[PDB]
Amino acid sequence: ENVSGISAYLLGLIIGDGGLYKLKYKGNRSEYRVVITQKSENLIKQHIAPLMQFLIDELNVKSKIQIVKGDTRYELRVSSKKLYYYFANMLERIRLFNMREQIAFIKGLYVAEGDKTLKRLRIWNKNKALLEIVSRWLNNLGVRNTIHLDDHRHGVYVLNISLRDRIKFVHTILSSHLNPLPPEAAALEHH
DNA sequence: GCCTTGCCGGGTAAGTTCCGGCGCG
DNA sequence: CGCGCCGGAACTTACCCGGCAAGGC
Ligand SMILES: [Mn+2]
Ligand SMILES: [Mn+2]
Structure with missing residues (x-):
């Protein structure tokens, strides 16, 4: 399905070098993040982001891809409840791949x-x-x-x-x- | 004598979770 | 008022890297 393959590739990166974060803040504020970190700028801007943006479009998620340059690494971040649960529910079913x-x-x-x-x-x-x-x-x-x-x-x-x-x-x-x-x-x- | 691979230490490229902000019904 | 996107970066270690050597052919 190609969407399925890209999703699964992305999950691999996320579960390896990123994560899925359900955040509570003051108050009672929240946030849902889909994250991949990498030292390589090219890897994140030229390889990962286009893959993510495609997935975002096909899922009609209207969050943006953020890229934050941290001290030790770049962070590709998508702040989206929908994408968060998209990858989480996919992870739940990982043995069904x-x-x-x-x-x-x-x-x-x-x-x-x-x-x-x-x-x-x-x-x-x-x-x-x-x-x-x-x-x-x-x-x-x-x-x-x-x-x-x-x-x-x-x-x-x-x-x-x-x-x-x-x-x-x-x-x-x-x-x-x-x-x-x-x-x-x-x-x-x-x- | 060459290769595969268990195990190990170095140290950085990862990961996690705070902050302040805005916009929505 | 109660949530969910944005933008940032401080905070620790889980990775990767590369050496050594036992074992196997
Ligand atoms: Mn990892
Ligand atoms: Mn990595």
Whole structure:
């Protein structure tokens, strides 16, 4: 559905390098935010924002994409109750993801949480269940993988993708054109 | 002798949650 | 009065990075 693939890719980025925030302020004021953070300005302005703006248009959400330059990172922010619950309800149903959504999400999550050298293929997160879900999808896609406690200091697990399956993982998941192609997958093959 | 990968420490690119503002019925 | 978009940025750590080495072929 392409809307579904982009949504799922975006959720991957959000759940990795952003978040979904229900805010209460004085009083009794509130706010609902959909957020992606990144150091890279290009990545946020040229790759992520156009994807988000498209999703906003098709959902007829009339909030704007904010870009705030913080001390350590840029924040792409959408202040929208509707978009907030759109991504939240999508997250609730994450185990129901079809194949295209699965691939797009994993794609998005790797851009956020992954080993970017590609010398190794690793996804970090403190959410073991999240990693396990991904792990099952990978297995079912013929991509072998293990999950371990990589960081004893902070409680961070890593999903390690077998180098024996480097090729399958990279061209099938990172270089798929069913979904938004990540920046140096769309550089990997116009090389 | 080369490769895969568990585990680890460094330190920054992430994430979370306050603030003040406005506009709406 | 009770909420929901805007604009910002202060506040801590969860990531990514890259080394080491045990194990395996
Ligand atoms: Mn994360
Ligand atoms: Mn990241």
